[PDB]
Amino acid sequence: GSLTEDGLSYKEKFVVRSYEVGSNKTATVETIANLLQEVGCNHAQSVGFSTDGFATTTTMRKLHLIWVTARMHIEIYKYPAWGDVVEIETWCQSEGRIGTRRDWILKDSVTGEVTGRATSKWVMMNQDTRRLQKVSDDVRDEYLVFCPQEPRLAFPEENNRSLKKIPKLEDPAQYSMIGLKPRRADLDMNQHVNNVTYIGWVLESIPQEIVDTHELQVITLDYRRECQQDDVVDSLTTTTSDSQFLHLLRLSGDGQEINRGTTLWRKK
Amino acid sequence: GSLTEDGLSYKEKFVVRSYEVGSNKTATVETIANLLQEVGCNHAQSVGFSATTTTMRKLHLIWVTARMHIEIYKYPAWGDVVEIETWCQSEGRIGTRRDWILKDSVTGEVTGRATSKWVMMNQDTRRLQKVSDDVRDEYLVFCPQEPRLAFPEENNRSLKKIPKLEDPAQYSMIGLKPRRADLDMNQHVNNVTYIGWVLESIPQEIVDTHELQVITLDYRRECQQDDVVDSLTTTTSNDSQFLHLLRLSGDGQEINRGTTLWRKK
Numbered sequence: 464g465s466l467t468e469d470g471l472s473y474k475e476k477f478v479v480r481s482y483e484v485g486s487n488k489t490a491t492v493e494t495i496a497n498l499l500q501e502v503g504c505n506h507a508q509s510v511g512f513s514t515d516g517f518a519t520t521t522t523m524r525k526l527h528l529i530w531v532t533a534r535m536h537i538e539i540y541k542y543p544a545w546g547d548v549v550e551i552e553t554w555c556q557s558e559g560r561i562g563t564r565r566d567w568i569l570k571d572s573v574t575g576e577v578t579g580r581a582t583s584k585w586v587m588m589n590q591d592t593r594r595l596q597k598v599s600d601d602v603r604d605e606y607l608v609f610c611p612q613e614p615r616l617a618f619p620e621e622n623n624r625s626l627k628k629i630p631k632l633e634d635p636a637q638y639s640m641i642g643l644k645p646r647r648a649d650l651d652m653n654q655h656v657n658n659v660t661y662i663g664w665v666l667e668s669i670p671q672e673i674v675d676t677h678e679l680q681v682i683t684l685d686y687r688r689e690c691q692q693d694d695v696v697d698s699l700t701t702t703t704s705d706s707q708f709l710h711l712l713r714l715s716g717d718g719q720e721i722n723r724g725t726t727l728w729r730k731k
Numbered sequence: 732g733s734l735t736e737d738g739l740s741y742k743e744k745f746v747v748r749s750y751e752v753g754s755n756k757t758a759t760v761e762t763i764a765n766l767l768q769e770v771g772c773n774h775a776q777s778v779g780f781s782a783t784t785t786t787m788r789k790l791h792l793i794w795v796t797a798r799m800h801i802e803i804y805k806y807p808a809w810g811d812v813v814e815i816e817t818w819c820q821s822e823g824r825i826g827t828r829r830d831w832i833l834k835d836s837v838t839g840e841v842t843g844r845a846t847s848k849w850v851m852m853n854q855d856t857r858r859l860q861k862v863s864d865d866v867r868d869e870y871l872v873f874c875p876q877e878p879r880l881a882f883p884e885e886n887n888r889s890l891k892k893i894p895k896l897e898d899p900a901q902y903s904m905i906g907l908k909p910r911r912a913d914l915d916m917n918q919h920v921n922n923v924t925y926i927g928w929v930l931e932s933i934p935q936e937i938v939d940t941h942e943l944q945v946i947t948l949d950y951r952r953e954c955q956q957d958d959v960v961d962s963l964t965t966t967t968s969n970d971s972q973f974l975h976l977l978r979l980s981g982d983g984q985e986i987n988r989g990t991t992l993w994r995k996k
């Protein structure tokens with residue numbers, strides 16, 4: 464992987480692995496999400512961000528600040544097959560005092576065609592109190608050095624899916640998978656649950672017949688609260704319809720919401 | 732990745748990913764196990780498989796994992812390049828073996844080694860069977876004919892007998908279930924998941940203060956998509972040793988047994 468000529472975006476190629484594919488011999492949406500996270504880390508390192516697991520700036524380190532995921536939105540047109548080379552381009556943009564955004568474009572390395580795109584929203588939080596915060600002048604300034612200054616958007620369309628409001632699922636859910644717990648392979652280097660695990664947990668409550676007869680086209684997931692190592696999760700799904708579902712992840716005990724989202728599936 | 736000049740082994744380089752590392756910023760033993768499985772698949776493809784032989788498909792036969800043994804000296808750090816060399820060998824009518832050597836691409840030093848035993852099974856009845864003359868002949872074309880062993884030693888750890896853990900276990904992690912990311916392309920539970928499940932019952936203080944040096948895992952029965960597993964551990968021991976057992980939560984049916992040796996950091 465490498466930064467592009469202008470130094471305002473980063474590209475990386477990945478060969479799709481045997482263990483990364485599903486029953487149709489193409490990448491799962493979790494493998495895609497992992498590759499998006501990997502190229503994001505490679506970009507942060509190339510532009511001088513800290514290693515240590517947290518991709519923080521020097522001002523963030525002095526003020527005990529971290530980035531927290533608020534939303535992940537992915538749209539896939541073609542999942543790469545086992546052995547294929549997928550090229551991913553990523554870049555960041557500041558969104559005033561609200562937070563920051565990381566966008567991605569996925570391409571077939573052989574044909575050069577776009578096979579997917581993703582967008583993510585990140586908000587500032589104090590690492591110790593876990594209290595949300597607005598982005599300060601000094602953080603916005605250090606972002607201007609490695610972000611395009613004109614808007615560059617993976618989802619440019621006005622009133623598109625990536626910015627849509629997601630409602631809260633009403634009890635009773637049509638489908639469910641209860642008692643989901645993270646194991647050591649679900650944690651990141653800082654022992655926090657990896658963001659991609661939440662996508663897996665959301666999908667667990669989709670019936671296997673939908674997975675066998677349909678392809679996932681779009682997934683939009685809101686992040687509200689982190690699941691701890693010792694927490695237990697319930698994943699709920701209701702068909703809202705192409706097939707569409709409304710999802711909700713909550714703690715098995717108190718019912719505390721941790722995630723909400725939607726998925727759109729196309730018949731094969 | 733590519734076959735070596737003689738065509739009797741396969742090498743591949745891997746860059747260690749951010750999501751693949753643990754608390755000390757080095758590869759987990761599950762990431763290593765996944766890389767071992769990946770280079771194995773790339774070797775099989777390069778020698779004409781897809782992973783059965785022509786005779787195996789004709790007779791509805793598949794390979795089933797019987798044992799996995801891994802020894803690590805240095806876990807590669809986040810961003811490092813690890814080179815893995817793999818090769819196969821026939822073991823008469825008993826089964827076959829796949830061996831691995833892990834090296835630091837920069838220094839060229841061996842940082843780990845692994846060995847795996849595979850037995851023949853009919854895909855439909857799930858009944859074990861001996862390797863036939865025709866299958867052994869197929870293996871001769873791409874396996875070294877002189878013995879090449881990752882674990883050469885006559886009484887080494889890789890061939891040791893593993894006993895069954897006695898109730899009550901000292902440690903446990905109950906109600907472990909596979910999710911879709913735990914399955915392979917054929918919807919069978921991935922071999923590496925079992926390693927993760929074994930380690931779940933090791934206390935977090937052991938993981939925080941010790942490094943895994945050796946893991947030996949026997950495979951006895953497959954966990955199905957709808958099965959629930961219990962993972963049990965008892966300390967058998969400056970080195971720490973554990974005896975492990977995976978069994979179904981309902982039945983108590985044994986699926987795996989194994990041992991791990993850990994060294995203090």
Ligand SMILES: Cc1ccnc(N)c1
Binds near residue numbers: 586687688689
């Ligand atoms: C947006 C948000 C707020 C708080 N905690 C999170 N994990 C995410």
Ligand SMILES: Cc1ccnc(N)c1
Binds near residue numbers: 795797859950952
């Ligand atoms: C060795 C062995 C025997 C039967 N089933 C397995 N999965 C493994």
